[PDB]
């Protein structure tokens, strides 16, 4: 049984491990490995401090998924946030990304953001299917935005706007 809850400092080390494992698959995230443990700590505690939406899915006191919205710094952009998420392989395709994504959205809307945006590889059909089901709209395509193994991948930009 999986519990979804706000990330705490207690979770950082296990989160680093989930992130690193998803990055290492090299077909979903913009990173190829997690950032070092120490960068990931500063960031998580930065997020915690500022009350930015950041949820982990926990099974057996281990983080098996995460979903977060980072608010933009820049004053003209501070009504917007950027979503990122990921789930360990065993836990995918069983409705958990939907649940995680609803918690995080509800917290971003509570926080007072107007606009949530994401970027997804054009070949990531399961991520795209989830985002469409949730209500994100396609806003365009960045040609050759990502280079992973000597290969260029497009990224689809998508967005949702709170009513």
Ligand X SMILES: CC(=O)SCCNC(=O)CCNC(=O)[C@H](O)C(C)(C)COP(=O)(O)OP(=O)(O)OC[C@H]1O[C@@H](n2cnc3c(N)ncnc32)[C@H](O)[C@@H]1OP(=O)(O)O
Which residues sit at the interface with ligand X, rule CB under 6 A?
22, 28-30, 84-87, 92-98, 118-121, 124-127, 129-130, 133
User: What CA–CA distance (Å, rounded) separates 61 from 82?
Assistant: 27
Please say which residue, 30 or 50, places its beta carbon nearer to ligand X. Answer: 30
Tokens of 82: 């950027």
Q: Which of 25, 163, 8 is nearest to 90 (CA)?
A: 25
Site for its own copies in 17-56 (CB under 8 A): 30-32
Least Å distance, CB 58 to its own copies, is 28
Tell me which of 117, 118, 131, 136 binds its own copies, using CB under 8 A.
Answer: 117
Q: Do residues 91 and 129 touch, judged by C-beta distance below 8 A?
A: no
Segments in 26-87 forming alpha helices (H)? 37-50
Q: Please report whether residue 148 would count as binding its own copies according to CB under 8 A.
A: yes
User: What CA–CA distance (Å, rounded) separates 63 from 55?
Assistant: 10
Residues that bind its own copies (CB under 8 A): 30-32, 74-80, 114-115, 117, 137-148, 152, 157, 159, 161
């Amino acid at each position: 049984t999986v519990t979804i809850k706000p990330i705490r400092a207690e979770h950082v080390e296990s989160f680093h491990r989930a992130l690193d494992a998803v990055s290492r698959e090299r077909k979903y995230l913009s990173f190829l490995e997690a950032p070092p443990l120490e960068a990931v700590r500063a960031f998580v505690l930065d997020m915690i401090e500022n009350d930015h939406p950041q949820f982990v899915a926990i099974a057996d006191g281990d983080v098996i998924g995460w979903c977060d919205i980072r608010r933009q710094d820049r004053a003209t952009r501070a009504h917007c946030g950027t979503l990122g998420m990921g789930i360990l392989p065993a836990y995918r395709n069983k409705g958990l990304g939907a649940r995680l994504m609803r918690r995080t959205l509800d917290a971003a809307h509570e926080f007072g953001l107007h606009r949530i945006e994401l970027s997804v590889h054009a070949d990531n059909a399961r991520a795209i299917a989830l985002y469409e089901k949730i209500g994100f709209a396609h806003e365009g395509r960045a040609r050759d935005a990502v280079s992973i193994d000597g290969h260029y991948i497009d990224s689809l930009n998508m967005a949702i706007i709170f009513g």
